[PDB]
Design a binder for this molecule. Sequence first.
Ligand code: UPC
Length: 483
Amino acid sequence: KSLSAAAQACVKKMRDAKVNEACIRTFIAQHVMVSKGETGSIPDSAIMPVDSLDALDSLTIECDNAVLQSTVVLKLNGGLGTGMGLCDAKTLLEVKDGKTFLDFTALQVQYLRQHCSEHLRFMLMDSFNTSASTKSFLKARYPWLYQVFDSEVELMQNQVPKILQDTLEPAAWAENPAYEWAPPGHGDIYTALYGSGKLQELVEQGYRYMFVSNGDNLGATIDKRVLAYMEKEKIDFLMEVCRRTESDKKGGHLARQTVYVKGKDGQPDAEKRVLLLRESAQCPKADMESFQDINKYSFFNTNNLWIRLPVLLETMQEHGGTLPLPVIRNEKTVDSSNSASPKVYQLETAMGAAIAMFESASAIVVPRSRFAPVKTCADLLALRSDAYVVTDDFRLVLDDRCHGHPPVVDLDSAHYKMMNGFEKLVQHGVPSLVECKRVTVKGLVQFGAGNVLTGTVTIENTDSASAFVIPDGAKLNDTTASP
Ligand SMILES: O=c1ccn([C@H]2C[C@H](O)[C@@H](COP(=O)(O)CP(=O)(O)OP(=O)(O)O)O2)c(=O)[nH]1
């Protein structure tokens, strides 16, 4: 009511689409913020760095199994993994030995149900793109999960209209009606859990803790030392972070901020703390130096989050059924391929940003073994290789002969960024990267079946007339090999 015609059009639009009401309430709130000209900037003058945290390696103590019976595991399955040029679900790529990401997860859940807590709950966050494939995979590979897939496993992600930069109205593309919508970031999970009523369901069913992570990350597995830690320190929201390195200067960082509880009564000294998240887009042009200074801001979000659900539900109800979160303003056109299509805004939230929205919240430093996404085919190769190994609880860990360090793989992105070409590289077989510090492939190359490599291994093809084919059983140590 009393909303600008622009907003009113969006409501009307989403109504006809039969869009969940929790999404419309949330999105309009976000639409208003933008319309009022909220910059969304997070300057250094508004924040202080975080310098000390508990480490996961230091905790020894495991929780009892009764805890795990009220735990929910939720993976994010929205991504298409187009970065490797794949038009279906990313989690469905083979990782090791005919097993996909979705395989290792399902097998890990299986372990916990049998050997620890049978009441453990598994859920998935699917986009419209990933829903069918995910269901079809489970129907063949994991019946029990499929059986309930529709009923309590699958949580569908919402879609939100792209608004015109020019009038903030819902964009209209007659060529492709589907391009009028966009996913609202992975922070939509909260809005999805509320409107679907599945938050209310779980809590009523006596489910307290939930662990959320990215599907493409095989580092993220349940660790009972984290659950015990939360119970002991009464934490409602725990964000796993790894250390920010030279490579991570582009990535966002964990920071802290101050508000005050009402009144100045008590000892007039002690302050408050809130933990927030700052993406690069939120940082102003002037503060970009410190932002990339990893000695000041030393931690980044691994997106492995443990949440206390009843508290989470309570919090949303205080704010009228939604969870306010900082809104990234995505500047695009309605059809990304068309440069001359109408310029639009896409409003997106991050799931890690909610940390600042909880009274009892914290951040724990985990080893980078717990942050292992496969963004590229180079990363995909490492896992196929014998450098890694599958455990009896179905974890993926680095073989002991690597002595803690995983083989760096450089692939020529002209040929190998695409999974298509990449498969041709490994077509005849797979090499042994366990003893290989660094491997590099330039130009067009195809591997022999059973080869092995040690130390620095460079493979260069400048000719690029056909492909340099490695002999079977060939061995390369601290060398470059061209034809
Ligand atoms: O909105 C989301 C975003 C991510 N993911 C999952 C899938 C991802 O593995 C992960 C984070 O992906 P991102 O950094 O967001 C990248 P991007 O989603 O642009 O990727 P593709 O273009 O789809 O390939 O969480 C979701 O389930 N929902």
